[PDB]
Amino acid sequence: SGFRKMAFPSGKVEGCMVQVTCGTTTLNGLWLDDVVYCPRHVICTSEDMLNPNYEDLLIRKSNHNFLVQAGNVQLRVIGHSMQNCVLKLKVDTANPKTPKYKFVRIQPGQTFSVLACYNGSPSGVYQCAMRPNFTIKGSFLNGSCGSVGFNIDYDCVSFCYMHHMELPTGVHAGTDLEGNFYGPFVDRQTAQTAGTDTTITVNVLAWLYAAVINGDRWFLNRFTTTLNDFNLVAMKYNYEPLTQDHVDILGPLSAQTGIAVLDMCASLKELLQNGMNGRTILGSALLEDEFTPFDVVRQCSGVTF
Amino acid sequence: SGFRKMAFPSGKVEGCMVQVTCGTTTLNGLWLDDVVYCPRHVICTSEDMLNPNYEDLLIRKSNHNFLVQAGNVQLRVIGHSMQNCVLKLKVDTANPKTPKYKFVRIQPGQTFSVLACYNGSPSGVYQCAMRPNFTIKGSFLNGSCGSVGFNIDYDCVSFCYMHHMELPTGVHAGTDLEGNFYGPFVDRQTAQTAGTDTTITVNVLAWLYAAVINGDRWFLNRFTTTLNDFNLVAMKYNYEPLTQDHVDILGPLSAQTGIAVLDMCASLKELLQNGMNGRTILGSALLEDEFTPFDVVRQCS
Ligand SMILES: *C(=N)[C@H](C[C@@H]1CCNC1=O)NC(=O)[C@@H]1[C@@H]2[C@H](CN1C(=O)[C@@H](NC(=O)C(F)(F)F)C(C)(C)C)C2(C)C
Ligand SMILES: *C(=N)[C@H](C[C@@H]1CCNC1=O)NC(=O)[C@@H]1[C@@H]2[C@H](CN1C(=O)[C@@H](NC(=O)C(F)(F)F)C(C)(C)C)C2(C)C
């Protein structure tokens, strides 16, 4: 028993992290086969980050302008190209540690593990959710850029996130591994703000299931609700609408606990109205929304990689 | 910016995890050079669990009674010895993935990462703290035994915990890597209860210092306290007594913020007195006690 914010094992991704230097800018790169991926803003000088012309800056640089270090070994860059907001450096050597991998774009509410790195060196791993406003509540200091988010499914690493920037509100913004930003952000030192966030309702319900599975039952009540009645109340409290998709996805947990989803919706509705009345759920005084249904079944079933 | 409960990268420990089987019992082992370390209770049957005579069970074992399996490879056991509650299997292959390592015994309030494993395969990694009552609030199912807790310092892995059992309150007990239990627990399936748990006061203060560094001051007050008056109040909320040692440890955070340790103690008294009144500190509506003074300086500016 027990319930923790649990990250994927980072071993396969630690094998891929390199240091990328262009002039005075150092940050992190992802070395897969004979390409290194990193944020395109590595080419920017102080003056440039305000209104950079990336295509302009890029064409003016020789391969030797990119210093790529895998531990003590310098990699020789034999090509460079842009793809949206990620720079792709072609190197002479395939990464012998390249895992089975895929680039995947994730939906809001979906969780991943972040491997925080500094000078191409893995520092820490944590579990995140893509917020509905396309930000992540990360922990990133100077030099964190190029740090990646991933999921594992058997032996396949799904890279979903590369870190680019921090928003003034202390939350974080980045791209998929094809350089497409998550959310309405641009890689420029101009002023940007995260939209107002909402709570991932399907994730809160999965976390209440995890509570019941661990013997925390006090919030269960005799009632049932409907999606409409639940969703009408939910919107009020800035809660994502619960779609029928969501109700089907909880089916395993519902069947495994004996608590039907629309019964659990009535328990969550009451929690939104009255709060938790000086009580905790799994030692939390807040309603936790960074666990997916699949995260709950995986931790509670002991799925390995 | 940001403040996350963060674990160490698990790669160096993943490289060391194996499956250890003895009779019908399978759990996880830790393979370092030519020794596999695992919980000695791998040699128990069902019946053996209440009053196992470990010395009696072990003399009856051959090296070839132990199946060790690193991925496909079955390792060959060329020696077995017990040390306290840890079985040590000598094998004929040094682990090539062996990192720089050392074994360390941690004190209550110290944090570490856990690589939860089943059948020598990792399920996931999370961050923990040795509770004052010498338990951990882990996430551990059947077959999790031999999963380890660790810290990483540059490229050196400090192993500090190996998992052995779950107490009736749903909390976890285990040993250092020399096989000595943390706390008064024994590797028998006998009635055992955790002592009443307390909050790790020094960690909460560190976390309040973290909140200030991250720019939140709402909970500061114009008061100070004596160490003694602080502890008299704190204990009424089941907080660990704060020692002069704890005060010395908090020195650097005190300096960085310019807030005296005993002023920060004054804020905690008030918070204990008032709660948070719909507010949060670093995104928590509870006071966080699983960040050490060291963890805060490591993760903050
Ligand atoms: C990459 N190593 C850093 C990571 C930062 C450092 C502090 N926390 C992080 O996540 N990324 C950057 O320096 C990017 C980079 C220019 C500006 N930038 C920022 O993160 C800045 N943010 C913004 O300009 C804002 F708010 F508009 F999003 C900063 C103010 C320094 C936090 C570029 C090219 C976007
Ligand atoms: C190792 N794979 C398990 C890990 C357990 C299983 C459930 N969650 C865990 O952390 N270890 C054990 O099964 C140990 C083992 C015998 C009994 N045991 C227990 O964890 C049991 N608890 C106790 O005996 C108690 F309460 F005293 F700690 C159990 C009832 C199965 C939870 C030995 C040798 C202690």
Author numbering:
A (entry chain B): 1 to 305
B (entry chain A): 1 to 301
Manuscript text:
For nirmatrelvir complexes, we determined the crystals structures of the WT enzyme, as well as M49I, N142S, G143S, Q189K, A193T, and A193S mutants at 2.1, 1.9, 1.8, 1.6, 2.4, 2.5, and 1.9-Å resolution, respectively. The binding modes of nirmatrelvir to both A193S and A193T mutants were similar, but the displacement is more severe in A193S, causing the disruption of pyrrolidone hydrogen bound with E166. Mutants N142D, R188S, A191V, A193S, and A193T showed modest diminished inhibitory constants for nirmatrelvir, with 2- to 3-fold increase in Ki values relative to the WT. Mutants N142S, R188S, A191V, A193S, and A193T showed similar relative catalytic efficiencies to the WT.
The SARS-CoV-2 Main protease (Mpro) or 3C-like protease (3CLpro) is a dimeric cysteine protease responsible for the cleavage of the viral polyproteins 1a and 1ab in 11 sites, including its own N and C terminal. Mpro substrate recognition has unique features and is specific for Gln residue at P1, hydrophobic residues at P2, and small side chains such as Ser and Ala at P1’. The absence of similar sites in human proteases together with the importance of the enzyme for the viral replication makes Mpro a primary target for antiviral discovery and development. Herein, we evaluated the effect of single mutations in the active site of Mpro from circulating polymorphisms on the kinetics and inhibitory constants of nirmatrelvir and ensitrelvir.
